[PDB]
Coordinates of C-alpha atoms in Angstrom, one line a residue:
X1 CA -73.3 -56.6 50.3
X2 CA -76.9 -57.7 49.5
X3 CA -80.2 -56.5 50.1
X4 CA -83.6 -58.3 49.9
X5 CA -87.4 -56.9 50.1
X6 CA -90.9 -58.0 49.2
X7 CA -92.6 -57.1 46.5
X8 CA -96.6 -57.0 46.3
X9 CA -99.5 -56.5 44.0
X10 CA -101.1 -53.5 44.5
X11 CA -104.7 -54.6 43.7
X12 CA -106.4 -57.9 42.8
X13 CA -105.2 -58.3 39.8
X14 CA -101.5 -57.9 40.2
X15 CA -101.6 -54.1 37.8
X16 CA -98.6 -53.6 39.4
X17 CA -96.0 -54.4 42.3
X18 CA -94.8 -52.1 45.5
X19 CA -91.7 -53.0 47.2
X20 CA -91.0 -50.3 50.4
X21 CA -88.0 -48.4 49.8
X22 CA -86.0 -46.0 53.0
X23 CA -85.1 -42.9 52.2
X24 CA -83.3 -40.0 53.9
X25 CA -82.6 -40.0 57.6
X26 CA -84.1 -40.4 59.7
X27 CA -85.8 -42.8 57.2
X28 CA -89.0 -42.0 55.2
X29 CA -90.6 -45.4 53.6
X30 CA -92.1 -45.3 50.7
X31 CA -93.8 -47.8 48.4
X32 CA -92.3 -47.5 45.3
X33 CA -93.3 -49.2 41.6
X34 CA -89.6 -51.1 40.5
X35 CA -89.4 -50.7 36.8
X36 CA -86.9 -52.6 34.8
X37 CA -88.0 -50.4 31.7
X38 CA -87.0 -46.9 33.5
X39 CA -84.5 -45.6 34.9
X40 CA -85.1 -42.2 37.1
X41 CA -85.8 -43.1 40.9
X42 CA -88.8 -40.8 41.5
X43 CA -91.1 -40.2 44.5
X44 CA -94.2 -37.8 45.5
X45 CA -92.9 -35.1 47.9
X46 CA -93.9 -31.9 49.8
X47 CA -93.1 -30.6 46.6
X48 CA -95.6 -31.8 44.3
X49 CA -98.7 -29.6 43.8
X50 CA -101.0 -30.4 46.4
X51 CA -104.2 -30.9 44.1
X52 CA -101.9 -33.8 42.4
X53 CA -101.5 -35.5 46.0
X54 CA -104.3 -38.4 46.5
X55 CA -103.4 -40.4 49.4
X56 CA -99.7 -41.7 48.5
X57 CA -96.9 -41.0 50.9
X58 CA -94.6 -38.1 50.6
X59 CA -90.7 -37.7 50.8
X60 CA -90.1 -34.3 53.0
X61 CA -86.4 -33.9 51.9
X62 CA -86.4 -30.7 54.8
X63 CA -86.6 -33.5 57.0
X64 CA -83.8 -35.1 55.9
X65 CA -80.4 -34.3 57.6
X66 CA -78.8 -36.0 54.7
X67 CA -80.6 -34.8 51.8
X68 CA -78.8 -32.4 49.6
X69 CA -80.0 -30.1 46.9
X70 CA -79.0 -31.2 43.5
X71 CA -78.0 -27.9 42.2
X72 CA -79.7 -26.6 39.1
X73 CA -80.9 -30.4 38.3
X74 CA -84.1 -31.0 36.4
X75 CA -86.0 -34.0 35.4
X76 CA -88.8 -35.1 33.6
X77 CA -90.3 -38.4 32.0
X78 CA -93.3 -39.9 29.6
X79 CA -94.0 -43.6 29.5
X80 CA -95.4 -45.7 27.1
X81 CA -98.6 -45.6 28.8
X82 CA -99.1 -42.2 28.3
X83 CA -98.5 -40.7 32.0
X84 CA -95.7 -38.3 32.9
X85 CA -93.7 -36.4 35.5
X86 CA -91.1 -34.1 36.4
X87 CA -89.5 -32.0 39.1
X88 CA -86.5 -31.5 40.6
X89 CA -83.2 -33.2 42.3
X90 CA -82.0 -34.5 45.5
X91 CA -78.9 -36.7 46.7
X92 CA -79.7 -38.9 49.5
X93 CA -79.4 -42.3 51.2
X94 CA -81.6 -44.6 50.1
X95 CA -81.8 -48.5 50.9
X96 CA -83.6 -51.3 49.8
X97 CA -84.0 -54.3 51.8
X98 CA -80.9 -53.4 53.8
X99 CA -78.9 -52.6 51.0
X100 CA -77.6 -48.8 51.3
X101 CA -76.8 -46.5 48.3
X102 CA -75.2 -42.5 49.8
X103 CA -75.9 -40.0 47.3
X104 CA -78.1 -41.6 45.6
X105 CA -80.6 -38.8 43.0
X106 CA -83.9 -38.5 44.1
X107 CA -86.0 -37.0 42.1
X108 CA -88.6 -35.1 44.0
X109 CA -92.0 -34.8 41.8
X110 CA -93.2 -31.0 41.1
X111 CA -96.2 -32.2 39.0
X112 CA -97.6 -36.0 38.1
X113 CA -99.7 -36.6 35.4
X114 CA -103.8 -38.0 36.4
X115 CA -102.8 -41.5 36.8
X116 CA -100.6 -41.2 39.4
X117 CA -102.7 -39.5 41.6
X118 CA -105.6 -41.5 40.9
X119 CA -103.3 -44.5 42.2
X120 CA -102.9 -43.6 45.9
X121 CA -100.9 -46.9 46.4
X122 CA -97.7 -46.4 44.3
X123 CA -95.5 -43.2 46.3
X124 CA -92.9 -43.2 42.9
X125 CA -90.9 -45.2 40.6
X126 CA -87.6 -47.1 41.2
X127 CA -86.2 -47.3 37.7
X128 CA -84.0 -50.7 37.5
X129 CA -83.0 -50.4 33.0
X130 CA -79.4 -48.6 32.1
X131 CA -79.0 -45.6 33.4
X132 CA -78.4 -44.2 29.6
X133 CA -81.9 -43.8 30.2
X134 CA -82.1 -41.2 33.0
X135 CA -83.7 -37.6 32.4
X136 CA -81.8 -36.0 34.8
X137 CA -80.8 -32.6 33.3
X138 CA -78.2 -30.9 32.9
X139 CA -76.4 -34.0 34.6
X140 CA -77.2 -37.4 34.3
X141 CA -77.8 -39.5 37.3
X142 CA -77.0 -43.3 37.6
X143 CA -79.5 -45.7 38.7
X144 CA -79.9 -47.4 42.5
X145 CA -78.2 -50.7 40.8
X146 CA -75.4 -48.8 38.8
X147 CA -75.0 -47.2 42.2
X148 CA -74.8 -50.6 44.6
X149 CA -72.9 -52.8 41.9
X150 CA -69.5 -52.5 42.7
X151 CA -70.5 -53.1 46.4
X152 CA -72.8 -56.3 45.7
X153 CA -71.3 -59.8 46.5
X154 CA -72.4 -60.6 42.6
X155 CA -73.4 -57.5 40.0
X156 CA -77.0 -58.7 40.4
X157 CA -80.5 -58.4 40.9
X158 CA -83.2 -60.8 40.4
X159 CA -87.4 -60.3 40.4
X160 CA -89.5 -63.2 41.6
X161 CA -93.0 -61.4 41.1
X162 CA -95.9 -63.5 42.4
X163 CA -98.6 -63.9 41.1
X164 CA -102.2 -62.8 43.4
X165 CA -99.2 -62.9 46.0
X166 CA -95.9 -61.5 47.4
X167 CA -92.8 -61.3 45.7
X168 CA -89.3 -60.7 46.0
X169 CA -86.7 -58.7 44.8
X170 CA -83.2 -59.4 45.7
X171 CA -79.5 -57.5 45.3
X172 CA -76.4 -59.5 45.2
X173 CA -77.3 -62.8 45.6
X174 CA -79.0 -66.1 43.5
X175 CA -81.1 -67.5 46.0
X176 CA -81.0 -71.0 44.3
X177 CA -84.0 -72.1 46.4
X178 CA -86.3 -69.9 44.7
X179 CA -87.2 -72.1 41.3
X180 CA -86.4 -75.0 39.8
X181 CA -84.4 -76.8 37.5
X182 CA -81.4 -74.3 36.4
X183 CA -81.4 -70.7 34.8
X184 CA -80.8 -70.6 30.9
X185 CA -79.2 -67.4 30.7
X186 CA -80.0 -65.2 27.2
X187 CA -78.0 -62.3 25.5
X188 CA -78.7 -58.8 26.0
X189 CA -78.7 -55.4 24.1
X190 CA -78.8 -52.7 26.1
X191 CA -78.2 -50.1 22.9
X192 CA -82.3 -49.1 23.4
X193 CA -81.2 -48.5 26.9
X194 CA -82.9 -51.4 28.3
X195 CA -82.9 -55.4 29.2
X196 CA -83.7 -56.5 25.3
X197 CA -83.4 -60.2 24.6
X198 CA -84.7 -62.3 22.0
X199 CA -87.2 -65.1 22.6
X200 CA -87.0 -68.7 20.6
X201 CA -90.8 -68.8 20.3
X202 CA -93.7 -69.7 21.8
X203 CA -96.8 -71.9 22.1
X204 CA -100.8 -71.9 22.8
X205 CA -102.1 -74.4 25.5
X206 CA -101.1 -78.0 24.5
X207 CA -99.9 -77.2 20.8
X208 CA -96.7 -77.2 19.1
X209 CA -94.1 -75.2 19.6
X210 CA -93.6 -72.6 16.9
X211 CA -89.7 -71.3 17.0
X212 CA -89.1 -67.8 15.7
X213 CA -87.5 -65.2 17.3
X214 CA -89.0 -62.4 20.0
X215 CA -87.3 -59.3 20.1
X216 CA -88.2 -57.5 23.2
X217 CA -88.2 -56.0 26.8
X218 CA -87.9 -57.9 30.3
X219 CA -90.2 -54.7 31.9
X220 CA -91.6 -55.1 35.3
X221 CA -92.8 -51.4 35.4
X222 CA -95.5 -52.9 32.3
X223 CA -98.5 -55.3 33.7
X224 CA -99.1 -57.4 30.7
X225 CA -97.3 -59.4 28.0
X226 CA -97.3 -57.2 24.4
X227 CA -96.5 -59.3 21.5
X228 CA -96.8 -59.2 17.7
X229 CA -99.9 -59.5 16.2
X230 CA -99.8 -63.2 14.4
X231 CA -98.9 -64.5 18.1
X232 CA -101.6 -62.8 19.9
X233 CA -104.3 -63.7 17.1
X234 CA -103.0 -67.5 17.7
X235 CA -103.6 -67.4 21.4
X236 CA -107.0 -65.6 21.6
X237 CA -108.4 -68.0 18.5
X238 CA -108.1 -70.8 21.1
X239 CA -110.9 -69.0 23.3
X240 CA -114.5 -68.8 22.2
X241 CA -115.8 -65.5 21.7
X242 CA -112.6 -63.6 22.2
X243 CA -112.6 -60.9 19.9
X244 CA -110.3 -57.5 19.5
X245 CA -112.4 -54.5 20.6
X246 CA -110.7 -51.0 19.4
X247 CA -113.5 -49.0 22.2
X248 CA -112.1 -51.3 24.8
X249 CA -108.6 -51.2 23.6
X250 CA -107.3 -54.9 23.4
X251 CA -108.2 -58.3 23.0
X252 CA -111.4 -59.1 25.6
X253 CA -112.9 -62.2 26.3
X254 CA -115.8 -64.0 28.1
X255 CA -115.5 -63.7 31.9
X256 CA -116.7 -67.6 31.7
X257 CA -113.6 -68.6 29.4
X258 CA -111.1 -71.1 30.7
X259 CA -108.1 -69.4 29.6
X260 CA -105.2 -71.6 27.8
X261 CA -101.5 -71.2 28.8
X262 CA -98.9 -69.5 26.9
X263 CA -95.4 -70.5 26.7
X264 CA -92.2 -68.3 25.8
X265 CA -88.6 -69.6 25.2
X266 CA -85.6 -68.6 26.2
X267 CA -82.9 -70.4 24.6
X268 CA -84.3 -74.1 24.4
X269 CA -85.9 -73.2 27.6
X270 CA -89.2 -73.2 28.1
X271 CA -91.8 -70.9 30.4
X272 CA -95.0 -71.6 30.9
X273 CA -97.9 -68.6 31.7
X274 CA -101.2 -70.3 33.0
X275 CA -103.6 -69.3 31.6
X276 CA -105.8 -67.9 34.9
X277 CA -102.6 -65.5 34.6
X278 CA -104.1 -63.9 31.9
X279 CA -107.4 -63.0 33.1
X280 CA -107.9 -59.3 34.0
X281 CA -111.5 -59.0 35.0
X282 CA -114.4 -57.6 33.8
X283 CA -113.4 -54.5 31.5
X284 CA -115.8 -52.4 33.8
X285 CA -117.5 -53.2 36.9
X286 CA -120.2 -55.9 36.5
X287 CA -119.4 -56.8 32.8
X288 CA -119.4 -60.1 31.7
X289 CA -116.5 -59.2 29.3
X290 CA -112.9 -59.4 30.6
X291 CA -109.6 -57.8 29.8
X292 CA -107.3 -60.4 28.0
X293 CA -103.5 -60.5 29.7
X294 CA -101.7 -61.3 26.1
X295 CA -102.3 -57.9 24.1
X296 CA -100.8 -56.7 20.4
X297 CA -97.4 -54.7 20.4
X298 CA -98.1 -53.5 16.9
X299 CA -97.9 -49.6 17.3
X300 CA -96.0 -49.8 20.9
X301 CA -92.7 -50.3 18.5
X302 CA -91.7 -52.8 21.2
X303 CA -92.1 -56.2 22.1
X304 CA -92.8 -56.1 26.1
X305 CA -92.3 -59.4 28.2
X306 CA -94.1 -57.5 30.9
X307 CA -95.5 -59.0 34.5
X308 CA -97.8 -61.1 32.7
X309 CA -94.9 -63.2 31.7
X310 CA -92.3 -62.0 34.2
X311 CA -94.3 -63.7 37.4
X312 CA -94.2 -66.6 35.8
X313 CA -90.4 -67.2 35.9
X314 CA -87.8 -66.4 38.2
X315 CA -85.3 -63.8 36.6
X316 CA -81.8 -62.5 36.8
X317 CA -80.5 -59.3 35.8
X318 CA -77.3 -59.9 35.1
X319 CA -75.3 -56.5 35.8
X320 CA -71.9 -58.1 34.5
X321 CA -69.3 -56.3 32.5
X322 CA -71.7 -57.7 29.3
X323 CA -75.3 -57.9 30.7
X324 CA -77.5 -61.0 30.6
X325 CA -80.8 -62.3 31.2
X326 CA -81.7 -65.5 33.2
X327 CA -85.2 -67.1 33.1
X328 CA -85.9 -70.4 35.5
X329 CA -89.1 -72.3 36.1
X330 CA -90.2 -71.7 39.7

């Protein structure tokens, strides 16, 4: 089997991507946030407290004749932004793209933490890293992919995030028409639980190519690119005025910059970020200060090849026996 579905930016500035997601029967679409860093399938529902609700689309699992109680099964989550959530468990079928999963866990949110409600366009989170990961207590639940991969064509899946644009993810399959040149494929440790690969090293704009190695995350559930330190300070000294602001929180810049590229490798492969992809906009609304796209990891603990850099490549998840990661030009 395979499945295929678009992806799209929720806002204007690509802070994160919805794909629409069928759940229960008869189905119930909703627009959920895929996340290559987590790994718990989670949705608003009629069970989450009403004050917590702002506008995003519910799953009714009463109004599902194939939804089952997860008996005694509890979940709860904190990401490295800060927000959180938890409730309780569901088995049901759940496709993507026309790709079917039965009993797949669905965890039906009890409470959210603020920044979920206050984003009325993201109904949940469809977690895509190793299922090592998943909260679901006292039994641990496996993942959507774990779930399809014995049933793809090829243990697969593959993001192709656009950028101020539509996207695609796809189950199964390499649809070869979808970049260029070939995929340089890159080792994997999942022993943190998620897609961590090393990167050969980067460059600013037009300079040289400084090789050292990247350790860290292929996360699409994470809008920017987090890096260390040095490599951030390189890239923003190429852009008058930037500075690092600690009351803003990151790197900002002025609005009338033109931003330089940034290039990543992978193997002796290169990716190349343009720079407008690094613009965030004005820090508030009607500042002439903008939110830089390339922010320090120092403190995260984690090196985050987030959409920033993801949308700029086309990438396989390579569900094999011994995972790998592909990166191609597109």
């Amino acid at each position: 089997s395979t499945g295929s579905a678009t992806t799209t930016p929720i806002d204007s500035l690509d802070d994160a991507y919805i794909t629409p997601v069928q759940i229960g029967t008869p189905a119930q679409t909703l627009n959920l946030d895929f996340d290559t860093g987590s790994s718990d399938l989670w949705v608003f529902s009629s069970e989450t407290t009403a004050s917590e609700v702002d506008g995003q689309t519910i799953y009714t699992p009463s109004k599902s004749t194939t939804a089952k109680l997860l008996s005694g099964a509890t979940w709860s989550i904190s990401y490295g932004d800060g927000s959180s959530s938890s409730g309780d468990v569901y088995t049901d079928t759940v496709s993507v793209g026309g790709l079917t999963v039965t009993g797949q866990a669905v965890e039906s949110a009890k409470k959210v933490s603020s920044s979920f409600t206050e984003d009325s366009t993201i109904d949940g989170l469809l977690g895509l890293a190793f299922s090592t990961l998943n909260t679901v207590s006292p039994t641990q639940q496996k993942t959507f992919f774990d779930n399809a991969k014995a049933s793809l064509d090829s243990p697969v899946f593959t993001a192709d995030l656009g950028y101020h644009a539509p996207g695609t993810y796809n189950f199964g399959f390499i649809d070869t028409t979808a970049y260029t040149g070939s995929i340089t494929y890159t080792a994997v440790s999942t022993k943190q639980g998620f897609w961590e690969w090393t990167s050969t090293g980067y460059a600013v704009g037009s300079g040289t190519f400084k090789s050292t190695s990247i350790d860290g995350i292929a996360d699409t559930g994470t809008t920017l690119l987090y890096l260390p330190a040095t490599v951030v300070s390189a890239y923003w000294a190429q852009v008058s005025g930037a500075k690092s602001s600690s009351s803003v929180g990151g790197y900002v810049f002025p609005c009338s910059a033109t931003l330089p590229s940034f290039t990543f490798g992978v193997g002796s492969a290169r990716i190349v970020i343009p720079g407008d992809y690094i613009d965030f906009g004005p820090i508030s609304t009607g500042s002439s200060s903008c939110f830089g796209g390339i922010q320090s990891s120092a403190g995260i603990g984690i090196n985050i090849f987030g959409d920033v850099a993801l949308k700029a490549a086309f990438v396989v998840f390579n569900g094999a026996t011994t995972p790998t990661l592909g990166f191609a030009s597109k």
